[PDB]
Amino acid sequence: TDVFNSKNLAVQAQKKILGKMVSKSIATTLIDDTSSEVLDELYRVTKEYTQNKKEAERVIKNLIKTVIKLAVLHRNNQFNQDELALMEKFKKKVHQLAMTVVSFHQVEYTFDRNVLSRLLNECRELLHEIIQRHLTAKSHGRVNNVFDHFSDSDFLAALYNPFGKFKPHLQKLCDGINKMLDEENI
Ligand SMILES: CCCCCCCC/C=C\CCCCCCCC(=O)O[C@H](COC(=O)CCCCCCCCCCCCCCC)COP(=O)(O)OCCN
């Protein structure tokens, strides 16, 4: 007759639900060994600047956590019409941030702390608004912890100081960002 036939379906649902959420979630955004180089450099410049190994650890952990959750949401079509448009603006703004970070190193002395703070904060606000309907307070805190550290004016000025400890880090960071850009991952 009619065995419990539903189970072959949620299973079909479960089967592919997984198919788009977990794979891309980590197979694609962070396990990209180049993403890890960039994150490692972000760690080093933060540790170098804060003189605190565990405050630097927490910044990068917050960042990695945010990116993953963001990916999973996206791949799961949990975003509505307005969150997708926001996400698309976010991606454009991060692309522009990435190229501006590089250009401020590649073109001598064009570093402008206000341009970078404006772009970083625009990313920050985009992220808050994207996750507003789907994440809790902890995630908003992670977003602020990450962007508070990187948009810090004195942090930015030191990172682009060509005479100090940070010069070789900026060079490595830029190599990594450019690699992501060239692979079209950002
Ligand atoms: C030194 C001063 C500035 C330092 C920067 C501090 C770092 C904070 C800034 C930005 C956070 C980066 C988050 C990137 C999110 C990318 C988009 C995303 O998460 O969604 C996913 C994107 O999917 C991808 O495969 C591409 C992005 C995955 C890698 C991004 C995560 C890397 C983590 C470290 C990146 C650092 C960026 C540095 C920028 C200056 C899912 O959407 P999609 O449909 O697959 O992509 C559509 C395009 N076909």
Residue numbers in the entry: 13 to 198
Reproduce the article's own wording on this structure.
Although members of the tumor necrosis factor (TNF)-alpha-induced protein 8 (Tnfaip8/TIPE/Oxi-α) family were originally described as regulators of tumorigenesis, inflammation and cell death, we previously discovered novel regulatory functions for these proteins in autophagy. In particular, Tnfaip8 inhibits autophagy in an mTOR-dependent manner under oxidative stress conditions. In conclusion, our data demonstrate that mTnfaip8 is a novel phosphoglyceride binding protein with PE as the most preferred substrate. PE binding in the hydrophobic cavity allows it to form a ternary complex with Gαi3, mTnfaip8-PE-Gαi3, and to mediate insulin-induced anti-autophagy.
The crystal structure of Tnfaip8 from Mus musculus (mTnfaip8) was determined at 2.03 Å resolution. Except for 12 flexible N-terminal residues (Met1-Ala12), all other amino acids are defined in the electron density map. The overall shape of mTnfaip8 resembles a water dipper. Its cylindrical domain has a dimension of 48 Å × 31 Å × 30 Å connected to an N-terminal grip-like domain composed of 20 residues with a length of ~35 Å. The dimensions of the hydrophobic cavity are ~20 Å in depth and ~7 Å in diameter at the bottom up to ~10 Å at the entrance. The cavity is lined with highly conserved hydrophobic residues. Intriguingly, two long electron densities were found inside the cylindrical domain of mTnfaip8. hTIPE2 and hTIPE3 also contain similar densities in the cavities of their cylindrical domains. As the most promising PE candidate, PE 34:1 was selected and modeled into the cavity because the known major FA compositions of PE from E. coli are C16:0 (36%) and C18:1 (31%). The PE-bound model explained a potent functional role of the three positively charged residues, H86, R87, K103, near the entrance of the cavity. These amino acids are next to the phosphate moiety of PE.
